[PDB]
């Protein structure tokens, strides 16, 4: 149950997805996965498989969640 995500704000945001390889968890929204339906059969985090992904946007979304708690 470790969250390791591209936002570097690794607390539970309520919707996480588990990397198939390293078994660490990411925030689905940081990876553009808005709901369960957007999650593919196979899934690897950005550490296990570098991808094009908007890291600044991920940080912005998560930092905003934290800032308005």
């Amino acid at each position: 149950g470790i969250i390791t995500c591209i936002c570097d704000l690794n607390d539970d945001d309520g919707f996480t997805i588990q990397c198939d390889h390293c078994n660490r968890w990411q925030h689905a929204i940081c990876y553009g996965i808005k709901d369960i339906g957007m999650a593919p059969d196979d899934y690897l985090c950005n550490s296990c498989d570098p991808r094009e992904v908007d890291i600044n946007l991920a940080r912005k979304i998560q930092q905003e969640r934290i800032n308005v708690k």
Binding site: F15, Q18, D20, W25, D41
Partner: peptide, 11 residues
């Protein structure tokens, strides 16, 4: 993939 999702509701 394997997912965890928490739903918060109020009735």
């Amino acid at each position: 993939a394997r997912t965890k999702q928490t739903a918060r509701k109020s009735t």
